C-alpha cells in the first residue's frame, strides 16, 4: 500500500577540520549509505547538525546530495522552521530539486517559544497546500512540543500531504499503536526513530519504517525485512546482536556516531562537529569502535 | 564610566500582511523609536521575531536599519547562532555595517540541545577574538541554559569583549546583584530586559540599562533617569504609572505589543506576526490600546 | 449561580525559628486574613510551603486551621498527591473536618513523572466520587502538566464535583475565555492566581475569583469589588495602586512575601521558611516593606 | 576498601489489586531479590513508586522490610524530602531501624521549585550531621536539578557522610569519569542506575555499583563481577545477552517490569501500580515475558 517503507537513515553533515562544508566526504557518505541497502535517506535533520549550518549551506547541501543521489533512492529533506512560509519555501525548493518527501518538526524556538495546537495545525496545512510531495511530522523531544496521538492522527486525517510520522518521544511503541488506531488508512507511514533503540517493540506496534543513524544501516535493515517476512525469531536475533552498538549510539556517542564510524572506515575525512558541540571523549570513541568491530559493519570495510 | 547606558529597546520586525519584509514600515519604526528618546536600539532579538526570518532577510534588515539609523544612536545587533563560526561571522559582519555592540544567546537548539560551560566559554571567547566591539550576553529562559553569576562574571573578567549582560531569568534582580558583586567593573553593563517588568527591583540591584519593548520606550526611560539622579520616589511614581502597560505587554500581548501600538498610531502598515505565531485576541488588543490610552505614549501620537 | 467567588488567599504555614510548626502564629495569621476581608481561605497549597511539611503536620494543620476558622469563612484544603486513592482520602478527610472545597493539582511527580490525559480524567473522577464538596483544578506550571481548555471543560461537564479552576499558567486570560466558552454553566468557578499579577486582564476574561497571596487581601479585594459593580475605571485605579506590591510579590519575594509582611506587623513570630528554601535577600525584604508602606495595608497596623 | 560494592536493586512497592499495601508479597519480593544474589537492597526510591504512598505507609514499609531482611544484606533507605529537617529525621530513623545507608535526591518539588547550590550543600551537610551511616546522592532527571561533577565531588570531600553517588542523568559514563577524578578517594561509591541500560559504558568509566530494577538482578550481577575480575570481553557477552531485557524495562515496561515478572513467577500477588500510573499495555507485557522467558531468570523459577 504505502509509497515508502523500510530504513531511511539520517545523513550526517560532514565538515572539514576547519568546520567548513566537506562536500566530497558528503557525497561519499551518501554513496556508502546507499550501498548499505538503505531504502532512502533523510538529510538536514537534527541528527545532521542542521542547527549548526546556514541557509546558504542548507541549499548547497540540498542540491549537492540530491544531484549525487541521481534518483537511486528517494530522499527525505528536513525543512523545519518556525515560520510557516519559510518552511513552505524550503519544502518547495526541496521538491524542485527532486525530494520525495519533506520532514518537519512542529514550529518551535528554544525552550519557551511554543505554538498552540491550532496554529501548529495551520502550519502543516499551509505547507501541505504549497507542495505535492508527502510530509513527515517529527515527534521528538528537541521541539519541547507535545504532539499527542489524537492530534497527530487528526493532522493526518485533516491535511492532504501529512501521511508520515517519525515518533521519537518516550513510549513510542504504544504511541504508534494509538496513532494507527485513530488514523486508519490516513497513516501511510508510522515510523520510529531514536537510532532504532526501540525498533523491536515499535515493529510489534505496527511500525512500517525506521529513521536510524547513518553509521550501520546494513545492521538494522535485516531486522525490518525479517519482520516483514514473518521471521520474528530471526528479527529478534539480529536485534540482539546489534543492540549494544545501537545502545552506545543512543546513550554514549550520539549524533557523532555515524561520522566517527565513517572516519575510522575511511569514508569521510573528518568526524569533527562544528564548534561548540562537544567532540567525542576518547574513551567513548574507543568503546564505540570496539563494539562495532565485533559486528563487521559495512562502514569499516567499505 | 561605561560606554553605553540607558534604554535600548528592541526594534520589532515589520512585515507586510503578505508575509514579506516591509522595509518602509521598518524605517518608520526605527525613526519613531529614536524620536521616543531611545539611548540606543537592539535588532534581530527574539522580540524581533528573529526565529521567523531567514538569513538573507537578516542581512537585508541589518544593512537597512543600520544605514537608516545613520549613527544617530548606537545599535546592538543580535547575532545568536549555535555554531561558533556562524555567530563570529555575523558579529563581524554586524561590526562592519556599523553596529556598536552584538548580543548573543549562549549556543543552544530547541528544548534538549545544550552546551557545557567549557564550550560556552570558548563560544564567547572565539566571538570575542573575531570582533572589536563589545558583546552582550543574553541570559533568558528561551535558551534553557544555566549561566551562573560566577560563570557570567568569569567571562567578563577573562573574555575581552564580553562586558554587557541582559539578565532576564527569574530572580533577575538578585542575580544582577551577584553578577555585580563577583564581577565588579568588569560588568560594564548589568542590564535587565523582559519589557521592564522588574525594572524598579533591577535598578535597586544596580542595573544601569534596560532592553525593553519597542512600543513605549519614552514611558520607561524617565524611570532610569530619575534613578540615576537619586530621585527614587519619582522613579517609583513613573514606574507605577506605566506598570499596568508594562504588565499587559509582559503577560498578555507580548512580542506583538509594540506592533499593535505602532499600527494603531500609523507608524507601521501592519501589526501581523509571521505565521504561525498567534495573532492578538481582539479583546487582548482592545485592553492593550485602552491601557495605552491612559498614558499618552508617543507611538499613539507620532505619525499624525 | 456559583457557590464560591471573590478573593481566596493562600494561608502560609508559620514555623517557629526552630523550624517546627508554630500553631499560635498560624491561628493569628488566619485571624488577620479573615479581618482583612478574605471571602475564604486556601491552605496547604504550594504557596503554603506544603512540599516542606509531613503528612502528620498536614493533618495537624488541617484540623487546627479549620477548627480555628470555626466556620467564619469557607476553606479550600489543597489535597494534591500523585496517588488517586491518597488524594481522594485526603479530600474526604478534609470534607469531614469542615472543608467547603478541595484543590488538587493534576497527578505528577518531579520534572519527569507525568500522567496521560485519560488517567488524569480518571483521577479527578474517582476523587469526585469520594466527596460531596466541589473540586478545584489547579493549572499551574509546577505540575509540568498540560491541561488544555477543552480538557478542563470536558472534565467540568462530565465530572460532577469538578467545577472550579485556578488558571495560572501563561496566557491565563485567554485560557479562561476559552474555558468559559467551552464549559458554559459547568464552569462554576473560573479563577486566576499568581498573586493577582494579571487580575485585570483575567477579570476582563470572565474570572469570578482570585487565589492571591495571604499578605494584603484588603488591597486586592476592592479590585474585584469595583469590577463586579461595573466601576471599571475604579477597578483599574486600585489595580495600578497595588500592582507594584503585587509585582514585587510575584517576581522578588514570592512565597515568603505574606510571611515577611505578617512578621513585620507582629502577626506572626517568625517569617523563616523551612530550610533549604532560601530566605529573603535583605534588600528584597526592605524593598517589599518600602512598597507596602506606601499602601497602608492592614497587615502593618493589625497587631 | 569501600564499604559497599556490587548490585543494589530497587525493591518495588507491592500493592494489592485493591491499591492497599500487600506486605506479604513485599516480604516475598525481598526474599527473592536476596535469593537472586543482590549485594544489597534499596527501598522507597522513585522506582518503588514512593511518590504514590503516604508517610505512614513509608514507615510501615521501612520497618517491615528492614526486619524481614534480618541483616542478610545492607539496605539503602531512600529518605528524600524537600525539607532538610524532615530528610534528616527520616534518615536518623532509618539508621535506628538498621539501615546501612540512605539515598537522597537534592531538595526539589515539582517542575519549578529548585534550590541553589549553597543550600543543597547545606542540605546534605546537616543531614550528614544528624546520622552516622553513609549518604548516597541521587542525580536523576526527576529532580530537574543540575548537580555538576565538581559540585558533587566537593560535597564528597567536605561533608563526612556524602560518599556514594547514583548517576543516571544523560551522559552518566563521562560524568562518572569526571566525578571519580575530581573526587579522588572521597568517592566511596560511584554508582549508576537506570535499570543498567548503560552499565557497560558506566563500568568502563569506573562505576563500582549498580542500582538496577528488581526483576532480574541475577542476570545483571555477573556483568559487574566479570568487570571486577578484569574479564572485559565476558562483561560484554553477558551484557549483550541481557540487554534486550534491560532495554525493554528501560523503554517499554518501566517501573512495572519487576512487578510483572514477579507476578508471573508467582513471587507476588499483584503487579498493578497505584492509580493513576498507567498499567502495562497487554502487548508490552507479552513482549516482556517472551524476552524474559529466553534468559531463564530466577524470578520465573523461585522456590524458597
mmCIF file with all atom_site columns, N, CA, C and O in Angstrom, chain A residues 173-174 177 194 197-198 201 204 236 239-240 243-244 247 250-252 281 283-284 287 291 294, chain D residues 173-174 177 194 197-198 201 204 233 236 239-240 243-244 247 250-252 281 283-284 287 294:
data_model
loop_
_atom_site.group_PDB
_atom_site.id
_atom_site.type_symbol
_atom_site.label_atom_id
_atom_site.label_alt_id
_atom_site.label_comp_id
_atom_site.label_asym_id
_atom_site.label_entity_id
_atom_site.label_seq_id
_atom_site.pdbx_PDB_ins_code
_atom_site.Cartn_x
_atom_site.Cartn_y
_atom_site.Cartn_z
_atom_site.occupancy
_atom_site.B_iso_or_equiv
_atom_site.pdbx_formal_charge
_atom_site.auth_seq_id
_atom_site.auth_comp_id
_atom_site.auth_asym_id
_atom_site.auth_atom_id
_atom_site.pdbx_PDB_model_num
ATOM 1   N N  . UNK A 1 173 ? 6.352  3.085   21.175 1.00 0.00 ? 173 UNK A N  1
ATOM 2   C CA . UNK A 1 173 ? 5.655  1.919   20.637 1.00 0.00 ? 173 UNK A CA 1
ATOM 3   C C  . UNK A 1 173 ? 4.146  2.049   20.804 1.00 0.00 ? 173 UNK A C  1
ATOM 4   O O  . UNK A 1 173 ? 3.390  1.946   19.832 1.00 0.00 ? 173 UNK A O  1
ATOM 5   N N  . UNK A 1 174 ? 3.687  2.284   22.031 1.00 0.00 ? 174 UNK A N  1
ATOM 6   C CA . UNK A 1 174 ? 2.255  2.403   22.275 1.00 0.00 ? 174 UNK A CA 1
ATOM 7   C C  . UNK A 1 174 ? 1.683  3.733   21.803 1.00 0.00 ? 174 UNK A C  1
ATOM 8   O O  . UNK A 1 174 ? 0.458  3.859   21.695 1.00 0.00 ? 174 UNK A O  1
ATOM 9   N N  . UNK A 1 177 ? 0.885  2.730   18.222 1.00 0.00 ? 177 UNK A N  1
ATOM 10  C CA . UNK A 1 177 ? -0.353 1.959   18.244 1.00 0.00 ? 177 UNK A CA 1
ATOM 11  C C  . UNK A 1 177 ? -1.567 2.876   18.207 1.00 0.00 ? 177 UNK A C  1
ATOM 12  O O  . UNK A 1 177 ? -2.442 2.740   17.345 1.00 0.00 ? 177 UNK A O  1
ATOM 13  N N  . UNK A 1 194 ? 15.019 7.409   16.888 1.00 0.00 ? 194 UNK A N  1
ATOM 14  C CA . UNK A 1 194 ? 15.931 7.245   18.018 1.00 0.00 ? 194 UNK A CA 1
ATOM 15  C C  . UNK A 1 194 ? 16.941 6.127   17.766 1.00 0.00 ? 194 UNK A C  1
ATOM 16  O O  . UNK A 1 194 ? 17.156 5.246   18.603 1.00 0.00 ? 194 UNK A O  1
ATOM 17  N N  . UNK A 1 197 ? 16.640 2.268   18.700 1.00 0.00 ? 197 UNK A N  1
ATOM 18  C CA . UNK A 1 197 ? 16.876 1.685   20.020 1.00 0.00 ? 197 UNK A CA 1
ATOM 19  C C  . UNK A 1 197 ? 15.682 0.849   20.466 1.00 0.00 ? 197 UNK A C  1
ATOM 20  O O  . UNK A 1 197 ? 15.845 -0.176  21.137 1.00 0.00 ? 197 UNK A O  1
ATOM 21  N N  . UNK A 1 198 ? 14.466 1.265   20.108 1.00 0.00 ? 198 UNK A N  1
ATOM 22  C CA . UNK A 1 198 ? 13.257 0.534   20.467 1.00 0.00 ? 198 UNK A CA 1
ATOM 23  C C  . UNK A 1 198 ? 12.607 -0.111  19.247 1.00 0.00 ? 198 UNK A C  1
ATOM 24  O O  . UNK A 1 198 ? 11.389 -0.295  19.211 1.00 0.00 ? 198 UNK A O  1
ATOM 25  N N  . UNK A 1 201 ? 10.113 -3.400  19.731 1.00 0.00 ? 201 UNK A N  1
ATOM 26  C CA . UNK A 1 201 ? 8.803  -3.082  20.287 1.00 0.00 ? 201 UNK A CA 1
ATOM 27  C C  . UNK A 1 201 ? 7.995  -2.197  19.346 1.00 0.00 ? 201 UNK A C  1
ATOM 28  O O  . UNK A 1 201 ? 6.762  -2.304  19.301 1.00 0.00 ? 201 UNK A O  1
ATOM 29  N N  . UNK A 1 204 ? 6.525  -4.423  16.689 1.00 0.00 ? 204 UNK A N  1
ATOM 30  C CA . UNK A 1 204 ? 5.362  -5.052  17.308 1.00 0.00 ? 204 UNK A CA 1
ATOM 31  C C  . UNK A 1 204 ? 4.150  -4.133  17.254 1.00 0.00 ? 204 UNK A C  1
ATOM 32  O O  . UNK A 1 204 ? 3.018  -4.590  17.054 1.00 0.00 ? 204 UNK A O  1
ATOM 33  N N  . UNK A 1 236 ? 14.474 -10.865 16.076 1.00 0.00 ? 236 UNK A N  1
ATOM 34  C CA . UNK A 1 236 ? 14.977 -10.698 17.436 1.00 0.00 ? 236 UNK A CA 1
ATOM 35  C C  . UNK A 1 236 ? 16.465 -11.017 17.518 1.00 0.00 ? 236 UNK A C  1
ATOM 36  O O  . UNK A 1 236 ? 17.221 -10.307 18.193 1.00 0.00 ? 236 UNK A O  1
ATOM 37  N N  . UNK A 1 239 ? 18.398 -8.132  16.105 1.00 0.00 ? 239 UNK A N  1
ATOM 38  C CA . UNK A 1 239 ? 18.259 -7.020  17.037 1.00 0.00 ? 239 UNK A CA 1
ATOM 39  C C  . UNK A 1 239 ? 19.149 -7.215  18.260 1.00 0.00 ? 239 UNK A C  1
ATOM 40  O O  . UNK A 1 239 ? 19.795 -6.269  18.726 1.00 0.00 ? 239 UNK A O  1
ATOM 41  N N  . UNK A 1 240 ? 19.211 -8.445  18.779 1.00 0.00 ? 240 UNK A N  1
ATOM 42  C CA . UNK A 1 240 ? 20.031 -8.708  19.958 1.00 0.00 ? 240 UNK A CA 1
ATOM 43  C C  . UNK A 1 240 ? 21.519 -8.568  19.647 1.00 0.00 ? 240 UNK A C  1
ATOM 44  O O  . UNK A 1 240 ? 22.281 -8.040  20.464 1.00 0.00 ? 240 UNK A O  1
ATOM 45  N N  . UNK A 1 243 ? 22.145 -4.653  19.251 1.00 0.00 ? 243 UNK A N  1
ATOM 46  C CA . UNK A 1 243 ? 21.665 -3.719  20.268 1.00 0.00 ? 243 UNK A CA 1
ATOM 47  C C  . UNK A 1 243 ? 22.768 -3.032  21.068 1.00 0.00 ? 243 UNK A C  1
ATOM 48  O O  . UNK A 1 243 ? 22.602 -1.839  21.382 1.00 0.00 ? 243 UNK A O  1
ATOM 49  N N  . UNK A 1 244 ? 23.875 -3.689  21.451 1.00 0.00 ? 244 UNK A N  1
ATOM 50  C CA . UNK A 1 244 ? 24.930 -2.946  22.166 1.00 0.00 ? 244 UNK A CA 1
ATOM 51  C C  . UNK A 1 244 ? 25.483 -1.774  21.376 1.00 0.00 ? 244 UNK A C  1
ATOM 52  O O  . UNK A 1 244 ? 25.830 -0.743  21.967 1.00 0.00 ? 244 UNK A O  1
ATOM 53  N N  . UNK A 1 247 ? 22.661 0.816   21.348 1.00 0.00 ? 247 UNK A N  1
ATOM 54  C CA . UNK A 1 247 ? 22.595 1.430   22.671 1.00 0.00 ? 247 UNK A CA 1
ATOM 55  C C  . UNK A 1 247 ? 23.730 2.427   22.870 1.00 0.00 ? 247 UNK A C  1
ATOM 56  O O  . UNK A 1 247 ? 23.524 3.505   23.440 1.00 0.00 ? 247 UNK A O  1
ATOM 57  N N  . UNK A 1 250 ? 22.865 5.524   20.948 1.00 0.00 ? 250 UNK A N  1
ATOM 58  C CA . UNK A 1 250 ? 21.808 6.305   21.578 1.00 0.00 ? 250 UNK A CA 1
ATOM 59  C C  . UNK A 1 250 ? 22.300 6.982   22.851 1.00 0.00 ? 250 UNK A C  1
ATOM 60  O O  . UNK A 1 250 ? 22.011 8.160   23.084 1.00 0.00 ? 250 UNK A O  1
ATOM 61  N N  . UNK A 1 251 ? 23.059 6.267   23.676 1.00 0.00 ? 251 UNK A N  1
ATOM 62  C CA . UNK A 1 251 ? 23.367 6.745   25.017 1.00 0.00 ? 251 UNK A CA 1
ATOM 63  C C  . UNK A 1 251 ? 24.724 7.420   25.139 1.00 0.00 ? 251 UNK A C  1
ATOM 64  O O  . UNK A 1 251 ? 24.888 8.290   26.001 1.00 0.00 ? 251 UNK A O  1
ATOM 65  N N  . UNK A 1 252 ? 25.700 7.051   24.311 1.00 0.00 ? 252 UNK A N  1
ATOM 66  C CA . UNK A 1 252 ? 27.080 7.485   24.508 1.00 0.00 ? 252 UNK A CA 1
ATOM 67  C C  . UNK A 1 252 ? 27.555 8.396   23.380 1.00 0.00 ? 252 UNK A C  1
ATOM 68  O O  . UNK A 1 252 ? 27.776 9.586   23.607 1.00 0.00 ? 252 UNK A O  1
ATOM 69  N N  . UNK A 1 281 ? 34.510 12.038  23.658 1.00 0.00 ? 281 UNK A N  1
ATOM 70  C CA . UNK A 1 281 ? 35.577 11.679  24.578 1.00 0.00 ? 281 UNK A CA 1
ATOM 71  C C  . UNK A 1 281 ? 36.336 10.480  24.012 1.00 0.00 ? 281 UNK A C  1
ATOM 72  O O  . UNK A 1 281 ? 35.717 9.571   23.445 1.00 0.00 ? 281 UNK A O  1
ATOM 73  N N  . UNK A 1 283 ? 37.581 7.829   25.286 1.00 0.00 ? 283 UNK A N  1
ATOM 74  C CA . UNK A 1 283 ? 37.086 6.552   25.788 1.00 0.00 ? 283 UNK A CA 1
ATOM 75  C C  . UNK A 1 283 ? 35.727 6.207   25.189 1.00 0.00 ? 283 UNK A C  1
ATOM 76  O O  . UNK A 1 283 ? 35.469 5.044   24.859 1.00 0.00 ? 283 UNK A O  1
ATOM 77  N N  . UNK A 1 284 ? 34.840 7.200   25.050 1.00 0.00 ? 284 UNK A N  1
ATOM 78  C CA . UNK A 1 284 ? 33.566 6.953   24.379 1.00 0.00 ? 284 UNK A CA 1
ATOM 79  C C  . UNK A 1 284 ? 33.790 6.496   22.944 1.00 0.00 ? 284 UNK A C  1
ATOM 80  O O  . UNK A 1 284 ? 33.106 5.588   22.459 1.00 0.00 ? 284 UNK A O  1
ATOM 81  N N  . UNK A 1 287 ? 35.372 2.782   22.871 1.00 0.00 ? 287 UNK A N  1
ATOM 82  C CA . UNK A 1 287 ? 34.377 1.750   23.148 1.00 0.00 ? 287 UNK A CA 1
ATOM 83  C C  . UNK A 1 287 ? 33.375 1.612   22.009 1.00 0.00 ? 287 UNK A C  1
ATOM 84  O O  . UNK A 1 287 ? 32.890 0.506   21.743 1.00 0.00 ? 287 UNK A O  1
ATOM 85  N N  . UNK A 1 291 ? 32.898 -2.095  20.080 1.00 0.00 ? 291 UNK A N  1
ATOM 86  C CA . UNK A 1 291 ? 31.623 -2.776  19.874 1.00 0.00 ? 291 UNK A CA 1
ATOM 87  C C  . UNK A 1 291 ? 31.393 -3.024  18.390 1.00 0.00 ? 291 UNK A C  1
ATOM 88  O O  . UNK A 1 291 ? 31.053 -4.137  17.973 1.00 0.00 ? 291 UNK A O  1
ATOM 89  N N  . UNK A 1 294 ? 33.080 -5.949  16.587 1.00 0.00 ? 294 UNK A N  1
ATOM 90  C CA . UNK A 1 294 ? 32.513 -7.272  16.825 1.00 0.00 ? 294 UNK A CA 1
ATOM 91  C C  . UNK A 1 294 ? 31.442 -7.635  15.805 1.00 0.00 ? 294 UNK A C  1
ATOM 92  O O  . UNK A 1 294 ? 31.103 -8.816  15.673 1.00 0.00 ? 294 UNK A O  1
ATOM 93  N N  . UNK D 2 173 ? 28.182 8.051   32.050 1.00 0.00 ? 173 UNK D N  1
ATOM 94  C CA . UNK D 2 173 ? 29.510 7.454   31.972 1.00 0.00 ? 173 UNK D CA 1
ATOM 95  C C  . UNK D 2 173 ? 30.595 8.521   32.054 1.00 0.00 ? 173 UNK D C  1
ATOM 96  O O  . UNK D 2 173 ? 31.490 8.447   32.902 1.00 0.00 ? 173 UNK D O  1
ATOM 97  N N  . UNK D 2 174 ? 30.521 9.532   31.185 1.00 0.00 ? 174 UNK D N  1
ATOM 98  C CA . UNK D 2 174 ? 31.526 10.590  31.202 1.00 0.00 ? 174 UNK D CA 1
ATOM 99  C C  . UNK D 2 174 ? 31.437 11.433  32.468 1.00 0.00 ? 174 UNK D C  1
ATOM 100 O O  . UNK D 2 174 ? 32.464 11.887  32.982 1.00 0.00 ? 174 UNK D O  1
ATOM 101 N N  . UNK D 2 177 ? 33.267 9.477   35.106 1.00 0.00 ? 177 UNK D N  1
ATOM 102 C CA . UNK D 2 177 ? 34.704 9.671   34.937 1.00 0.00 ? 177 UNK D CA 1
ATOM 103 C C  . UNK D 2 177 ? 35.167 10.934  35.648 1.00 0.00 ? 177 UNK D C  1
ATOM 104 O O  . UNK D 2 177 ? 36.089 10.899  36.469 1.00 0.00 ? 177 UNK D O  1
ATOM 105 N N  . UNK D 2 194 ? 19.355 3.600   36.324 1.00 0.00 ? 194 UNK D N  1
ATOM 106 C CA . UNK D 2 194 ? 18.555 3.498   35.103 1.00 0.00 ? 194 UNK D CA 1
ATOM 107 C C  . UNK D 2 194 ? 18.505 2.062   34.580 1.00 0.00 ? 194 UNK D C  1
ATOM 108 O O  . UNK D 2 194 ? 18.734 1.794   33.399 1.00 0.00 ? 194 UNK D O  1
ATOM 109 N N  . UNK D 2 197 ? 20.850 0.244   31.900 1.00 0.00 ? 197 UNK D N  1
ATOM 110 C CA . UNK D 2 197 ? 20.822 0.430   30.450 1.00 0.00 ? 197 UNK D CA 1
ATOM 111 C C  . UNK D 2 197 ? 22.192 0.837   29.919 1.00 0.00 ? 197 UNK D C  1
ATOM 112 O O  . UNK D 2 197 ? 22.546 0.506   28.781 1.00 0.00 ? 197 UNK D O  1
ATOM 113 N N  . UNK D 2 198 ? 22.990 1.540   30.724 1.00 0.00 ? 198 UNK D N  1
ATOM 114 C CA . UNK D 2 198 ? 24.325 1.967   30.317 1.00 0.00 ? 198 UNK D CA 1
ATOM 115 C C  . UNK D 2 198 ? 25.408 1.339   31.190 1.00 0.00 ? 198 UNK D C  1
ATOM 116 O O  . UNK D 2 198 ? 26.468 1.933   31.393 1.00 0.00 ? 198 UNK D O  1
ATOM 117 N N  . UNK D 2 201 ? 29.076 0.929   29.514 1.00 0.00 ? 201 UNK D N  1
ATOM 118 C CA . UNK D 2 201 ? 29.803 2.189   29.403 1.00 0.00 ? 201 UNK D CA 1
ATOM 119 C C  . UNK D 2 201 ? 30.128 2.760   30.777 1.00 0.00 ? 201 UNK D C  1
ATOM 120 O O  . UNK D 2 201 ? 31.196 3.350   30.974 1.00 0.00 ? 201 UNK D O  1
ATOM 121 N N  . UNK D 2 204 ? 33.226 0.843   32.192 1.00 0.00 ? 204 UNK D N  1
ATOM 122 C CA . UNK D 2 204 ? 34.443 1.391   31.599 1.00 0.00 ? 204 UNK D CA 1
ATOM 123 C C  . UNK D 2 204 ? 34.873 2.659   32.320 1.00 0.00 ? 204 UNK D C  1
ATOM 124 O O  . UNK D 2 204 ? 36.068 2.906   32.509 1.00 0.00 ? 204 UNK D O  1
ATOM 125 N N  . UNK D 2 233 ? 35.828 -8.776  28.071 1.00 0.00 ? 233 UNK D N  1
ATOM 126 C CA . UNK D 2 233 ? 35.091 -9.417  26.987 1.00 0.00 ? 233 UNK D CA 1
ATOM 127 C C  . UNK D 2 233 ? 33.926 -10.241 27.516 1.00 0.00 ? 233 UNK D C  1
ATOM 128 O O  . UNK D 2 233 ? 32.893 -10.351 26.846 1.00 0.00 ? 233 UNK D O  1
ATOM 129 N N  . UNK D 2 236 ? 30.963 -7.899  28.305 1.00 0.00 ? 236 UNK D N  1
ATOM 130 C CA . UNK D 2 236 ? 30.186 -7.599  27.108 1.00 0.00 ? 236 UNK D CA 1
ATOM 131 C C  . UNK D 2 236 ? 29.229 -8.734  26.772 1.00 0.00 ? 236 UNK D C  1
ATOM 132 O O  . UNK D 2 236 ? 28.064 -8.494  26.431 1.00 0.00 ? 236 UNK D O  1
ATOM 133 N N  . UNK D 2 239 ? 26.354 -8.861  29.105 1.00 0.00 ? 239 UNK D N  1
ATOM 134 C CA . UNK D 2 239 ? 25.618 -7.631  28.830 1.00 0.00 ? 239 UNK D CA 1
ATOM 135 C C  . UNK D 2 239 ? 24.779 -7.768  27.567 1.00 0.00 ? 239 UNK D C  1
ATOM 136 O O  . UNK D 2 239 ? 23.580 -7.462  27.565 1.00 0.00 ? 239 UNK D O  1
ATOM 137 N N  . UNK D 2 240 ? 25.394 -8.247  26.482 1.00 0.00 ? 240 UNK D N  1
ATOM 138 C CA . UNK D 2 240 ? 24.678 -8.412  25.222 1.00 0.00 ? 240 UNK D CA 1
ATOM 139 C C  . UNK D 2 240 ? 23.534 -9.410  25.348 1.00 0.00 ? 240 UNK D C  1
ATOM 140 O O  . UNK D 2 240 ? 22.498 -9.252  24.692 1.00 0.00 ? 240 UNK D O  1
ATOM 141 N N  . UNK D 2 243 ? 20.829 -7.358  27.498 1.00 0.00 ? 243 UNK D N  1
ATOM 142 C CA . UNK D 2 243 ? 20.442 -6.016  27.066 1.00 0.00 ? 243 UNK D CA 1
ATOM 143 C C  . UNK D 2 243 ? 19.024 -5.914  26.510 1.00 0.00 ? 243 UNK D C  1
ATOM 144 O O  . UNK D 2 243 ? 18.345 -4.924  26.830 1.00 0.00 ? 243 UNK D O  1
ATOM 145 N N  . UNK D 2 244 ? 18.514 -6.848  25.695 1.00 0.00 ? 244 UNK D N  1
ATOM 146 C CA . UNK D 2 244 ? 17.120 -6.706  25.236 1.00 0.00 ? 244 UNK D CA 1
ATOM 147 C C  . UNK D 2 244 ? 16.113 -6.688  26.372 1.00 0.00 ? 244 UNK D C  1
ATOM 148 O O  . UNK D 2 244 ? 15.094 -5.995  26.274 1.00 0.00 ? 244 UNK D O  1
ATOM 149 N N  . UNK D 2 247 ? 16.734 -3.264  27.968 1.00 0.00 ? 247 UNK D N  1
ATOM 150 C CA . UNK D 2 247 ? 16.177 -2.228  27.106 1.00 0.00 ? 247 UNK D CA 1
ATOM 151 C C  . UNK D 2 247 ? 14.656 -2.186  27.200 1.00 0.00 ? 247 UNK D C  1
ATOM 152 O O  . UNK D 2 247 ? 14.059 -1.104  27.251 1.00 0.00 ? 247 UNK D O  1
ATOM 153 N N  . UNK D 2 250 ? 13.728 -0.503  30.320 1.00 0.00 ? 250 UNK D N  1
ATOM 154 C CA . UNK D 2 250 ? 14.043 0.921   30.333 1.00 0.00 ? 250 UNK D CA 1
ATOM 155 C C  . UNK D 2 250 ? 13.077 1.733   29.470 1.00 0.00 ? 250 UNK D C  1
ATOM 156 O O  . UNK D 2 250 ? 12.771 2.883   29.805 1.00 0.00 ? 250 UNK D O  1
ATOM 157 N N  . UNK D 2 251 ? 12.575 1.161   28.376 1.00 0.00 ? 251 UNK D N  1
ATOM 158 C CA . UNK D 2 251 ? 11.811 1.931   27.401 1.00 0.00 ? 251 UNK D CA 1
ATOM 159 C C  . UNK D 2 251 ? 10.346 1.537   27.288 1.00 0.00 ? 251 UNK D C  1
ATOM 160 O O  . UNK D 2 251 ? 9.533  2.370   26.883 1.00 0.00 ? 251 UNK D O  1
ATOM 161 N N  . UNK D 2 252 ? 9.980  0.303   27.627 1.00 0.00 ? 252 UNK D N  1
ATOM 162 C CA . UNK D 2 252 ? 8.617  -0.174  27.425 1.00 0.00 ? 252 UNK D CA 1
ATOM 163 C C  . UNK D 2 252 ? 7.878  -0.419  28.735 1.00 0.00 ? 252 UNK D C  1
ATOM 164 O O  . UNK D 2 252 ? 6.875  0.248   29.006 1.00 0.00 ? 252 UNK D O  1
ATOM 165 N N  . UNK D 2 281 ? 0.452  -2.019  28.832 1.00 0.00 ? 281 UNK D N  1
ATOM 166 C CA . UNK D 2 281 ? -0.279 -2.466  27.661 1.00 0.00 ? 281 UNK D CA 1
ATOM 167 C C  . UNK D 2 281 ? -0.102 -3.975  27.512 1.00 0.00 ? 281 UNK D C  1
ATOM 168 O O  . UNK D 2 281 ? 1.002  -4.492  27.729 1.00 0.00 ? 281 UNK D O  1
ATOM 169 N N  . UNK D 2 283 ? 0.278  -5.944  25.019 1.00 0.00 ? 283 UNK D N  1
ATOM 170 C CA . UNK D 2 283 ? 1.373  -6.300  24.125 1.00 0.00 ? 283 UNK D CA 1
ATOM 171 C C  . UNK D 2 283 ? 2.724  -6.061  24.787 1.00 0.00 ? 283 UNK D C  1
ATOM 172 O O  . UNK D 2 283 ? 3.634  -6.893  24.671 1.00 0.00 ? 283 UNK D O  1
ATOM 173 N N  . UNK D 2 284 ? 2.876  -4.927  25.477 1.00 0.00 ? 284 UNK D N  1
ATOM 174 C CA . UNK D 2 284 ? 4.109  -4.660  26.210 1.00 0.00 ? 284 UNK D CA 1
ATOM 175 C C  . UNK D 2 284 ? 4.396  -5.766  27.216 1.00 0.00 ? 284 UNK D C  1
ATOM 176 O O  . UNK D 2 284 ? 5.543  -6.215  27.352 1.00 0.00 ? 284 UNK D O  1
ATOM 177 N N  . UNK D 2 287 ? 5.484  -9.018  25.363 1.00 0.00 ? 287 UNK D N  1
ATOM 178 C CA . UNK D 2 287 ? 6.852  -8.910  24.872 1.00 0.00 ? 287 UNK D CA 1
ATOM 179 C C  . UNK D 2 287 ? 7.853  -9.023  26.014 1.00 0.00 ? 287 UNK D C  1
ATOM 180 O O  . UNK D 2 287 ? 8.916  -9.635  25.860 1.00 0.00 ? 287 UNK D O  1
ATOM 181 N N  . UNK D 2 294 ? 13.394 -16.128 27.530 1.00 0.00 ? 294 UNK D N  1
ATOM 182 C CA . UNK D 2 294 ? 14.552 -16.566 26.770 1.00 0.00 ? 294 UNK D CA 1
ATOM 183 C C  . UNK D 2 294 ? 15.825 -16.618 27.605 1.00 0.00 ? 294 UNK D C  1
ATOM 184 O O  . UNK D 2 294 ? 16.830 -17.164 27.139 1.00 0.00 ? 294 UNK D O  1
#
